[PDB]
Symmetry: D2
Amino acid sequence: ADTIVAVELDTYPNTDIGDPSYPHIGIDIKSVRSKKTAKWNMQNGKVGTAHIIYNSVDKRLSAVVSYPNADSATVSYDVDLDNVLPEWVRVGLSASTGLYKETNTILSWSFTSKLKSNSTHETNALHFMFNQFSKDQKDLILQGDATTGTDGNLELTRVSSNGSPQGSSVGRALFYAPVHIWESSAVVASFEATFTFLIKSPDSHPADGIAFFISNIDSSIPSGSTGRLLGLFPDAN
Amino acid sequence: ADTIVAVELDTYPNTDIGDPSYPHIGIDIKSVRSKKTAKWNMQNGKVGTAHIIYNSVDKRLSAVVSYPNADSATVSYDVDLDNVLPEWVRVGLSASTGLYKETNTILSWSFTSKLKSNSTHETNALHFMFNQFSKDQKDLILQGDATTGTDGNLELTRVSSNGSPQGSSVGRALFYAPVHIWESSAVVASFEATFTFLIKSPDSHPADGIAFFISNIDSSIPSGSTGRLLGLFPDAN
Amino acid sequence: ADTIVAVELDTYPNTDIGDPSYPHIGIDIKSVRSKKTAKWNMQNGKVGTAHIIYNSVDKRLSAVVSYPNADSATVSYDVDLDNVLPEWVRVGLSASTGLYKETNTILSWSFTSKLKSNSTHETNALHFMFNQFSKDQKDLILQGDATTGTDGNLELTRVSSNGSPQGSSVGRALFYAPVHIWESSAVVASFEATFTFLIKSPDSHPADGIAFFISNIDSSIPSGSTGRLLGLFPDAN
Amino acid sequence: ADTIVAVELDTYPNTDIGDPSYPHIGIDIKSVRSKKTAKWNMQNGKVGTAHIIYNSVDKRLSAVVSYPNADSATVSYDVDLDNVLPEWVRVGLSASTGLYKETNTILSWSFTSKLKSNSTHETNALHFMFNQFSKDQKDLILQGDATTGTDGNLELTRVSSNGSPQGSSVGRALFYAPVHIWESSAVVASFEATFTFLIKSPDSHPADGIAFFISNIDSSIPSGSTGRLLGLFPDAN
Ligand SMILES: [Ca+2]
Ligand SMILES: [Ca+2]
Ligand SMILES: [Ca+2]
Ligand SMILES: [Ca+2]
Ligand SMILES: [Mn+2]
Ligand SMILES: [Mn+2]
Ligand SMILES: [Mn+2]
Ligand SMILES: [Mn+2]
């Protein structure tokens, strides 16, 4: 089905499916059951920043999530992405709410993929940066309940006009152009993703999380992937 | 119809339609009849480089075409692009051959659009760089006879297996993602395009030229735009 | 003496020396008597952003100063910088206070110089970005009363421990490495400067202003260049 | 003494000091006795490209050396650079010749250091790119026999007017500005270095090699560091 590789900012601990007993960041390879996790001291109502990095030489997918004036949370996992993802992929953001809710607002998003060939001065690159979103953001593919424009932000899950987050919501935002992650002549290949988010909930138990993902080009929201499955996976296997 | 703004590398002088009596570079705004031209000392069989620049403050579209070890050709035209092009556009390359022919090979292509808002640290940007093309270049829209892959280059017009350019050929290559050229909150907006080309013909009178263009998102090759019309315009008005 | 080219954010109108009757931005070429000015609706206590741009093709030095939620101020002047500045220069920021005062705080500073040769794929570039300053900022040359470190900012003029700006202060910050602005093989040359500032004064008549400048490598603060002369010029000619 | 961390392109095997029996690339931490090496199929007279990368999250210094149309050589070593290098350093290139010789020509050099803070949108960066060198390259510190200008290249070791490399030569080129490699508020820190070189010798046994290095700011050529010690180390310990 959809080949998924994602870094989840999981706000709700579903221990029955492997989530530890606290908010956390995790590296998911084809499954919602993180291959590796790290405790995340989430701050309700605060704007945070997540950094995802990876290069073909070291073969390690790492993420660093921090908030201003606080210590960072870091998680790493050794994975040869070439062995998992197709040649052409699409990058994006996903978020959902189940019985519990939260806003899943994106205020800025930037990505950069580089492929360096063995040729003299040969380098292929893509780089997008959104520091503000428009009502008609033509270079983005919105799936589910995701919308842009509301005071220049990307609302991944449904937020009522009064500012209250809705439950049972799922939405994803993908960049319009496919990204070339593997090249036969490439000696070095790497990508860098960064985004500022704002998880806010009037409850003491927000859910379910935000996730940066990389999938096959024709990826779409799996059925009933609201809640714990973050709009990325079809089941909890 | 198609809103076209292009910088043409016109190899053949069609004096009847306004072309001066020699190879040249020109700034075309909605018409093949350049609004401004500059003599271009073209070098058959040599790899050249073209630089196109524009910013919303100065409001001047400029281009610089040079070859190694030779002097450059420069042409500028004052134009408030906002008054000519839609909010969302698509960028690309076009080329054609008429009774006379030439190869219209692209070896590298890079583009960069920036939109700076009046907000603190707010900047939206897009940047692509192709230093090599693949047979299946999914992030490119090929129209007409254009193909990629042949020793990693983009062949805009038909070139036979033995390396001979075909006449009456037209082809264009557009980047997959739409580019946002105007933003309501932008204080400064600008774009930079650069490409290395290789015009080669066994004849002493090559034709018809290469052109970097910016059009409305759903642009396609006009009918009978081979030859002098460079695959951009439908007629010579 | 010192070859100076600067974009001044002049907060105090010294009409006797050519300043119009209001706060303004101006392009100074070798003299404090701006060659071109534009009214600037300054906002005391608000963080602003200034954008300075220039390229060798268009030959126009432009600046755009804005504040969040307000309209921008823009000023342009046609000047072939090659005819004014030496081959190697140094870039920096300057600020002063006279009988009237104000804080001249810099919160971020970035610069980018590019020189493109007529050679295939040849480009020389420099780019620095300061989004925070340290007490020991070794890559900066501080002259006068300028200091860094205070909550990660660059204080160009003296600010007492209680936060009050001192009068008769002058200070400048220059990047450590000389910048190459002209190259004999360059077909295109350009630079981009951007900085966020914070002009704040307890008085209704702040003075004297901030200025981004480009000088000869061994530039230093002229004598008695406090006040109206912004630490750039020795006299009011 | 000088804190040295370097990636050596060692053309001559000095087995007595730990060099394997063939040309190779190696990661040297404070000693010429590489902490890790990889066989390098060097090509006399061909222009090559070396890529050095490192980030504070993964803590792995890697290098990739390739030539057009050939397979690459890669070597990696896990090292927390913070534990080895001072806060402020200087980056550069070094090369030497002993009883055997070779040209140690640099045709292009680029470096990029990034420091991302835990603050929203805070990033400090430096980036230089030399695609050509001038006779008076003011932003470079030349030590030893290194010179720039000769057809726009950086000659690290002495090359006679007729093009013949001299033995017993040592020269280094350092960037003028100190680089900040550690910051107390940084969540992620990383640097990327790339350079095209040309090792050419009329002999079948060229020596001694090229090396990209990072040292303490006031670094200079150790005495008698010609030959096998590549101008970086004082002895073979
Ligand atoms: Ca969960
Ligand atoms: Ca023509
Ligand atoms: Ca004044
Ligand atoms: Ca050796
Ligand atoms: Mn989880
Ligand atoms: Mn024409
Ligand atoms: Mn003034
Ligand atoms: Mn060795």
